[PDB]
């Protein structure tokens, strides 16, 4: 059907390249958050877990629009699901 935002590969490859879009990149995106590149993509990913990493996901997903991020990952999910079949 259509899915809800969970972290995983295409949540960190969307939120990446929405930076992009909007001409940031990662390292300058982290530093306002006192956090590191490396500890944004752990979050991103799902890897971390705590409920520090949902803090920071959720500002992932403020940046983009929240209704602009669901538009973007479930296209891109849309897509591999094409190549799967």
């Not at 899915?3 to 940031?24: A, E």
């Not at 993509?41 to 409920?51: D, E, I, L, P």
Request: hydrophobic residues 40%; glycine residues 8%; positive net charge.
């Amino acid at each position: 059907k259509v899915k809800s935002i969970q972290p995983g590969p295409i949540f960190y490859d969307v939120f990446l390249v929405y930076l992009r879009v909007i001409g940031t990149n990662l390292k300058d995106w982290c530093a306002p958050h006192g956090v590191t590149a490396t500890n944004a993509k752990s979050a991103a990913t799902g890897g971390w877990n705590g409920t520090k990493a949902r803090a920071l996901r959720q500002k992932m997903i403020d940046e983009v629009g929240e209704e602009t991020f669901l538009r973007l990952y479930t296209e891109r999910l849309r897509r591999e699901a094409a190549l799967e079949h």
